[PDB]
Subunit: 201 residues, 6 copies
Amino acid sequence: PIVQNQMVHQCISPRTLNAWVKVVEEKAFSPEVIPMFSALSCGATPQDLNTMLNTVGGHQAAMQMLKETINEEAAEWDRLHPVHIAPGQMREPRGSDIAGTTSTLQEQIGWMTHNPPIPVGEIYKRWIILGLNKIVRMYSPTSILDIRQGPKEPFRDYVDRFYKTLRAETLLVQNANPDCKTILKALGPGATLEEMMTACQ
Amino acid sequence: PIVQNQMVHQCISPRTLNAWVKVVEEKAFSPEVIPMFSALSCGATPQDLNTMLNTVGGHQAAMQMLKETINEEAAEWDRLHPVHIAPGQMREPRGSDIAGTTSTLQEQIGWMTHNPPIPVGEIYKRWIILGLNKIVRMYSPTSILDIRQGPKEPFRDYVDRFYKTLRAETLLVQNANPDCKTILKALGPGATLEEMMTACQ
Amino acid sequence: PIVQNQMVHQCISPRTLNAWVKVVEEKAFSPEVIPMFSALSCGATPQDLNTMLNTVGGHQAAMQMLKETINEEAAEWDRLHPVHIAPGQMREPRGSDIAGTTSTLQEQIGWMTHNPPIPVGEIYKRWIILGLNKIVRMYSPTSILDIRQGPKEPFRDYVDRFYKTLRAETLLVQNANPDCKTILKALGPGATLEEMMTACQ
Amino acid sequence: PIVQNQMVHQCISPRTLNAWVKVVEEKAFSPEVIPMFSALSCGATPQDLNTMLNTVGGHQAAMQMLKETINEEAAEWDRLHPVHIAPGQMREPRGSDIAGTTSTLQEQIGWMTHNPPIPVGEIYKRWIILGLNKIVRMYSPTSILDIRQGPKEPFRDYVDRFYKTLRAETLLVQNANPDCKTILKALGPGATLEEMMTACQ
Amino acid sequence: PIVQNQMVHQCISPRTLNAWVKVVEEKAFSPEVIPMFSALSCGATPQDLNTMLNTVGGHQAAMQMLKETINEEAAEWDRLHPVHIAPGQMREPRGSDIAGTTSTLQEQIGWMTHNPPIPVGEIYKRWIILGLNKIVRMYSPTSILDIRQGPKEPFRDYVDRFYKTLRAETLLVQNANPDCKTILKALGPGATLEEMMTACQ
Amino acid sequence: PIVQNQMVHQCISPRTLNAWVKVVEEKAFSPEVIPMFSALSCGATPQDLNTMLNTVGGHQAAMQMLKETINEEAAEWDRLHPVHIAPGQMREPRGSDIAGTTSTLQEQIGWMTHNPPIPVGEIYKRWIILGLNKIVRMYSPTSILDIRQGPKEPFRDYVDRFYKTLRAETLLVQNANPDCKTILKALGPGATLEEMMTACQ
């Protein structure tokens, strides 16, 4: 990553490397892996971002899809920012430079610490999360339409499933079981979630 | 977080990230999770606070309720502090800025390190703990009225349950078993907890 | 805590937070938990001390007793140091300020780093350990009078139990078994512990 | 490694040492071990690189092959950069110097921190990864030609295997099972991977 | 401990605290615990040394014996260095000051960082190791006279036991079994251990 | 160890201490323990080196042999560098000084940071590794002559054993099984290891 000492490059830590690999092993593409990815990649160069992605051993279908999305964003970057070098001067980054496949670490450091800064690490991270979100959506196992409260399922457990599904991807009341539904309907309009859960507790 | 070097931004640590996720996995919304949250979020920006909340994978009912409380505090903030920008100057934060959904990290850093400082991290944390407390209360499994000493339950174990329940949510003596109750009644008024526990030991 | 960089505030560490919670989970109120508490709270502000106590999830009877002792010391502090503020100036701390319930972190930092320093962290820690010691004493399971060497119990194991009990709360010889007692009596006056243990080895 | 303080030598960490040894124990020569190796060897001197390789206890066939590749690159280096010393002056590195077998740490530090820098750590790392890639290829257990979707194998699981094999080492559709193949064929030309996987989901 | 920044006090680490407690739990008073103690107490003040000893929960017989030895060394210190204070000046340390029971941390820091330094941490550590060595000796389970090679015991295993016993507390050959003894006797005078072990391998 | 801040002494870390003790517990004297020892002792003083050796609890036969080798190197040092002190001046180190048994830490620091430096830590480490190598050789369980490919043993597994044995201590082809041997013989002269392994794969 790049962090302050002056902004300077620091080696990615074994702790960071292991944390990412483990989250993926343990959580796959559950939605909460994305915020973890973003935090673990705080201050990351494109090189660092590639390191994190490349250290993943499984899920190679997903990792290929991600490359596809990345290449799509890089092409759109090239469409909006065509590049044209002068001895000793900073060149303009193209898509594959931001994605760290045709740029060196030193070039990335130069862009990231220039004045004004060209935040290639942040730009690349945005593309990666765009791709990751597609994957989270794809690997979501259930439709919100199929999340319905069971006959003796605690309302809390049902709401947990409902919003967990919504995150991966009136209905709450509709999909509630008969007993709870009657209670919720009587609540009247404008009830908060807290109120509904207390009601069916 | 923001910490001294001068106050500067530091990336949230893998240790901090894991600690929070693990406490929630292991303790759910037992009351002692709140002090842990506050300590783990020492010096946190709103971005950091969102990271911590968002990295939680389960309990999505609770996490939705929390969003509700947060939006309520943000609206009250907007009611008390309407915002009106000048080139190069600091804008005033609105509710959603303090909650980190419409403000950038750099803006948050600017507010937090301004003179005088606008402690958006501390303001947001207060809202979050307000919401968390509601959840702790909701998920409290038992009424203090239902905590009564068992026939052969050690007084100490009963007092543990009693104050554990009180924390999540004369009575102590009333709910004690007959044998202990007689002892405690004879103690007379003004007895400390230490005295009562020694008495029924 | 407060530590040198100049004395400055540092966030309490996840390592420190976990260590304390784990010692309590694993050792309860065995006497050796107190020295651990004191060391883990090296340089602690009152806020930090409250964090450590509050992160404990079990033993709520004990934690209530501790609050009682703390309030007693705070009242005695107020009796000896009545407080009377001038714009921009440091106010005098009352009991509840030292206990961190009515003082802010910044006020605590101000007191702790003033010249001369008002060591509110050290004063509060003394009160807490006073209360903790009462609890260790209360939860001590056995009287030293009931620690007697078994017929075929190794002398070393008996001495371990004896001094372990003494810590939680002539007698050594008296409570020794017949065979060892005869040996020890013949040792004559003034024998060290090392000498007694070698003798009955 | 060499890192900034000025560039200075830092001892390789126990964390780094253990991480590498463990990845090899746990993952052998699966392709994702290479990006991990490169990241764990961030800033490494040739001495550090040798340390990492030499701390591996198993896989001695592979480690011998790696030495072979290294010696081949060192010979080609010597062919392109013949060396010819002046009292107090920096000598030119030969192949075995870059590979750290005939150069001292101080010499390596001198080369790496000279102006202009002679990046012997980076040059050696390139040779090592060249050799490691050969090994990954050798230890790849299956031909991409033998990766075919099973009768009731989820398309996602099949694509995972396919790209995992491709990494170690039209075909995707050809090797898909009859049911999925029909769907994919109807998709028409130009379908992305995301589209194919959704189609056969 | 005291370490350089200038020599300054640093809080004892949770890592250090746990390491010591664990070694004692896992190894008791095996001889190798002493070098570990000395290393873990690198730079320790007397306060730190007391912390380490006091955090031990078991072995209270041993811990009492240690106090006895410590008091004996402190008395001999007082015999050789009688103490006689001037406003603002450093007082001379007595035995119990070096042992940290009647001296404050600030006094210990003052002594340890004075010019010339009065190394109270090192002096106390010497006393503690003197006491620990007595305990290692006491808890040594076997006499070197009872370490004899078994009929089919590998010579290496026998030598391991022999020198392990010697550490806790011609003979090597004498106690070897008949077959090995014959070989060793034929070796002639002056044979190294390596030679003997190779011979009976 | 000694490291830069200026070169200064740093306490050996609990992480380093534990890593070494664990490697020995887990790997005994397998050859890869030596590179680990050298890396973990980066920057070590003789005191540190003794700490590492002395913290080992088992293998006391080996540890005695090591002392023997160390004393032999120290005697040869004394033969080549006889020592002859001037008030305030640095004395010359003898063998036992380099081995840290008759020199203080401060003396070791003085030698190691003098200009020109007298690298007593590096000199001692060389002696220790000389002794360790003897032990690795001694504890090697099998002769390379007894490493022969089994009838249905994969060539790769056989080569692993062969070079693992060679490390602890034409033949490769000779010791290969009949089927593989025929293939290898037909390969002709000059075949690399990679080529042989591919051939018999």
